[PDB]
């Protein structure tokens, strides 16, 4: 860490295979309530324009 030119600051980081302890928290996802899909047929259709 230290001992190169300017002295650097140091952190250790765990591997993947093992943390193993870190502060784990259950999370609840919440989007509601009714989800829908409508089909507004185009009023006034033509070869020139859909509206």
């Amino acid at each position: 860490m230290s001992n190169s030119a300017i002295p650097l600051n140091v952190v250790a980081v765990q591997e993947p295979r093992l943390e193993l302890n870190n502060e784990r928290t259950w999370v609840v996802v919440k989007g509601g309530q009714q989800v829908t899909y409508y089909p507004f047929p185009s009023t006034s259709f033509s070869s020139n324009q859909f509206n």
Binding site: T43, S44, Q49, N51
Partner: protein
């Protein structure tokens, strides 16, 4: 009577512009069933044939 008339295929003309911030007024249909159904698209200026501008009106429209 002399008519120009019942004969014509021109029933309207319509300038429309899909750009200018504008406001969107509906054009009428020829459908019967039904009416309803208000539509919305910008409509700028538009006129029916003005009877009588006498033929030639077949030559040009003007407003």
């Amino acid at each position: 009577y002399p008519t120009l008339s019942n004969w014509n295929a021109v029933k309207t003309i319509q300038l429309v512009s899909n750009l200018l911030p504008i406001n969107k007024e509906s054009i009428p249909s020829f459908r019967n069933s039904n009416v309803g159904i208000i539509n919305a698209q910008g409509i700028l200026a538009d006129f029916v044939p003005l009877v009588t501008n006498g033929p030639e009106a077949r030559i040009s429209i003007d407003f």
